[PDB]
Write a protein that binds this DNA or RNA. Structure first.
Length: 539
DNA sequence: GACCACGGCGCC
DNA sequence: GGGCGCCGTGGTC
C-alpha cells in the first residue's frame, strides 16, 4: 500500500475509529480512505469528513450518523457488512466478517478502509448469480441504511421531568412491598438475588419447587413458577409486582433520562442492521423497541415519549402481518379467504375447528384460535398448549388436528420448507433472504426438533421483516418531501413525527404506503393513531 | 473500572 | 417459544 495525502479520490472506501460504538456520543478519533492501493489519512477527522460525499465502508451507516450530527448530510453508501449479512445472516460484525473473508479487523481508520475494499471486493464478487439476494441489497439494505441513519440522528423527544416524578413515587411503592415481603420471611434479605429468594421460598418456606434452571440447574424463581404458586402463598403475588416495578424502573424510568443527548434533548437509539438471524432489525443503547405498554405502569412510561411541541406522533401497526404473510406463503385458500373476507382470523378460525353453527357463542373458543395461530407460527406443542391454555394432552392433540383439517397447506408448507431446508441447508423469505439451519439432519430429536422450529419460522418472520424493511425505504423519501420524520420502528409497527398542520395528512399516506408496499395474496391491514405522546397516539 | 455467565423479563 | 437486548447478582482480572 502507498501512503497518500488526505484528499482522497472520488468514491473511496472510508475507514474510521470512533471513541466508542454509539455514533451519537462517540468522537471521530480518526478518518481515512482507500482506493486502488493507496491509503489516505486525514490529519484531522472532523474537517476531512467534509471532503466525502458519502460513506462507503463497514458500519457506513454509523459514520453517516456522526457526520449527520455535525451538520453534514453525508449519506451512507456501499458497505461490505451488509453484503455478508445477506450471504449469511450469521455474519453480524466486522471482526468475524473479516476474520472469515480475508482480513483482520483492526483499530486503524486506514487499515479499515483497506480492509473494506478488499472485503467489498471479495464479497461483491461472491455475489455472482445471486439475483434475489442482490435485489435485497440494492432495493432494500443499502437504501435503508440511510433511513436508519436519519432515524438515529433525529432522535426522540422524551419528557424527563415526568419520568423523574415516576421514579420517586415508584421507588416508594417498591419499598412498601419490600417491607411486606421482608416480614413474610420473618427477616429481610436482598430481594433481587434469585438465590436468596430460592433459599427463602423453597427452603425456609415449604413451597413446591416446580422446576430448575437451564445452565446451573438451581430451583427457578421464574414468573411462571411463581404464578403457579399464586394460590399457595400470598407473598408470591407481592413478589411478582416487585419484580414488575423493579424491571420497569431499573430498565426504563431511571436509565432513560440520562441518555438524553445534550445537543438535542432527545433519545438516540442504535438501529442495528446486520444483527438478526431472521433479517429483523434490533436496537441498541438504548433499545426503544421494548418500551413497556401492557401494565398500567408500563403505559405511564410510554406516555413519557412525546413529540416536539407544535408537532404530533403518528403510530402505524401492521395488523398481524406474520399470519397474513403465512397466508400468502402457505396458500391455504381457506386461510387467505378469512383475511380477504375482512374477517377476524381468531374468530373465523375458531368458527372452523369447532364446526360450530356460525361464529356465535364461543367466548373462550376465540381465546383459543389466537394461540393456535400464534402457535402454528412457531409450532407450539400440544403440551405447551395444555399448560398455557387450559386443556388436557388429549384435547391439545386434537385441536392441532382439527386446526390443520381447516388449514392443510400450512402443514404442507411447513413440511415442504422443512424438507427443502435439509436438502439445501437453508430456508428463505419471499424475496430470497436465507438463514442456514445445519442441525436439521441432527440425530438428537431434542436439538433437531428445535432446529425445525427455528428453521421454519424464519420465512414468515424474515419476509414480514423484508416487507416493513421495504416500506420503510419506500416511505421516508415522501416523508422528507413532507417535512415529517421517522422516529422509531418496532418490527411490525412504526412511529413518526409530523407537524400539527400536516400531521393527519401524513397518516393516511404512510398507511397506504405500507399497505401496498408489496401486495400479497392477501391485504396488509394497518391501524393508525395520532397523539402528543406514544401512549395517546393509540399505538 | 472493564467485562463475563446466568437467570429473569421487557418488546415484536 | 420464534426473534432480540438490558438488568442486578456474583464473581474475575
Amino acid at each position: 500500500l502507498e501512503e497518500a495525502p488526505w484528499p482522497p479520490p472520488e468514491g473511496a472506501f472510508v475507514g474510521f475509529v470512533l471513541s466508542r460504538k454509539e455514533p451519537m456520543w462517540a468522537d471521530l478519533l480518526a478518518l481515512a480512505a482507500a482506493r486502488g492501493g493507496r491509503v489516505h489519512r486525514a490529519p484531522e477527522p472532523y474537517k476531512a469528513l467534509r471532503d466525502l460525499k458519502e460513506a462507503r465502508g463497514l458500519l457506513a451507516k454509523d459514520l453517516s450518523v456522526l457526520a449527520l450530527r455535525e451538520g453534514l448530510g453525508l449519506p451512507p453508501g456501499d458497505d461490505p457488512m451488509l453484503l455478508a449479512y445477506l450471504l449469511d445472516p450469521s455474519n453480524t460484525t466486522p471482526e468475524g466478517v473479516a476474520r472469515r473473508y480475508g482480513g483482520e479487523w483492526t483499530e486503524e481508520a486506514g487499515e479499515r478502509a483497506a480492509l473494506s475494499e478488499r472485503l467489498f471486493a471479495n464479497l461483491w464478487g461472491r455475489l455472482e448469480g445471486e439475483e434475489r439476494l442482490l435485489w435485497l441489497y440494492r432495493e432494500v439494505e443499502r437504501p435503508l441504511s440511510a433511513v436508519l441513519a436519519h432515524m438515529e440522528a433525529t432522535g426522540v423527544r422524551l419528557d424527563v421531568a415526568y419520568l423523574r416524578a415516576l421514579s420517586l413515587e415508584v421507588a416508594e411503592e417498591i419499598a412498601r412491598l419490600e417491607a411486606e415481603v421482608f416480614r413474610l420471611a420473618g427477616h429481610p434479605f436482598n430481594l433481587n438475588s434469585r438465590d436468596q429468594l430460592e433459599r427463602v421460598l423453597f427452603d425456609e418456606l415449604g413451597l413446591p419447587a416446580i422446576g430448575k434452571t437451564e445452565k446451573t440447574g438451581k430451583r427457578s424463581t421464574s414468573a411462571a413458577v411463581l404464578e403457579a404458586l399464586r394460590e399457595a402463598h400470598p407473598i408470591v403475588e407481592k413478589i411478582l409486582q416487585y419484580r414488575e416495578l423493579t424491571k420497569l424502573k431499573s430498565t426504563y424510568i431511571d436509565p432513560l433520562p440520562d441518555l438524553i443527548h445534550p445537543r438535542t434533548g432527545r433519545l438516540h437509539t442504535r438501529f442495528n442492521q446486520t444483527a438478526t438471524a431472521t433479517g429483523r432489525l434490533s436496537s441498541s443503547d438504548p433499545n426503544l423497541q421494548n418500551i413497556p405498554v401492557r401494565t398500567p405502569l408500563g403505559q405511564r412510561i410510554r406516555r413519557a415519549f412525546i413529540a416536539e411541541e407544535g408537532w404530533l406522533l403518528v403510530a402505524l401497526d401492521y395488523s398481524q402481518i406474520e399470519l397474513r404473510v403465512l397466508a400468502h406463503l402457505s396458500g391455504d385458500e381457506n386461510l387467505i379467504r378469512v383475511f380477504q373476507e375482512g374477517r377476524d382470523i381468531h374468530t373465523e378460525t375458531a368458527s372452523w375447528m369447532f364446526g360450530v353453527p356460525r361464529e356465535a357463542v364461543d367466548p373462550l373458543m376465540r381465546r383459543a384460535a389466537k394461540t393456535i395461530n400464534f402457535g402454528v407460527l412457531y409450532g407450539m406443542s400440544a403440551h405447551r398448549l395444555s399448560q398455557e391454555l387450559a386443556i388436557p394432552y388429549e384435547e391439545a392433540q386434537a385441536f392441532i388436528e382439527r386446526y390443520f383439517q381447516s388449514f392443510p397447506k400450512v402443514r404442507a408448507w411447513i413440511e415442504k420448507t422443512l424438507e427443502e431446508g435439509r436438502r439445501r441447508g437453508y430456508v428463505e423469505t419471499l424475496f430470497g433472504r436465507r438463514r442456514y439451519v445445519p442441525d436439521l439432519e441432527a440425530r438428537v430429536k431434542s436439538v433437531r426438533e428445535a432446529a425445525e422450529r427455528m428453521a421454519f419460522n424464519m420465512p414468515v418472520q424474515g419476509t414480514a421483516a423484508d416487507l416493513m424493511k421495504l416500506a420503510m425505504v419506500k416511505l421516508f423519501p415522501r416523508l422528507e418531501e413532507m417535512g415529517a420524520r421517522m422516529l422509531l420502528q418496532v418490527h411490525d409497527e412504526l412511529v413518526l413525527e409530523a407537524p400539527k398542520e400536516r400531521a393527519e395528512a401524513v397518516a393516511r399516506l404512510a398507511k397506504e404506503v405500507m399497505e401496498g408496499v408489496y401486495p400479497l395474496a392477501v391485504p396488509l391491514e394497518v391501524e393508525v393513531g395520532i397523539g402528543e405522546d406514544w401512549l395517546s397516539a393509540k399505538e
